[PDB]
Amino acid sequence: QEDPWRHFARTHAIGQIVPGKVTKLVPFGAFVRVEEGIEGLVHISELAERHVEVPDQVVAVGDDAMVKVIDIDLERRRISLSLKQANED
């Protein structure tokens, strides 16, 4: 243990806004590539304040967007980000 997923914690400061790559998406959340092996899911609400049907409206496959790293769940190999807070801070 204490490898890649951990490595993020020891390498990236939480709360910073970082450009990632939206590789995959689904109607409830989108997956951004921040570091190899960890993908950040962004809830449909974190995308926009209005009715978003599918993340594709805002972020499609291959989208490179700076998002705020709000949390890191390295024990579940997950990472949390929100475009709302990215614009907020």
Curated annotation (Swiss-Prot):
Gene responsible for this protein: rpsA
Coiled coil: none
Species of provenance: Mycobacterium leprae (strain TN)
Family of this protein: Belongs to the bacterial ribosomal protein bS1 family.
Domain S1 motif: 15-84
Protein name: Small ribosomal subunit protein bS1
Described purpose of this protein according to its UniProt entry: Binds mRNA; thus facilitating recognition of the initiation point. It is needed to translate mRNA with a short Shine-Dalgarno (SD) purine-rich sequence.
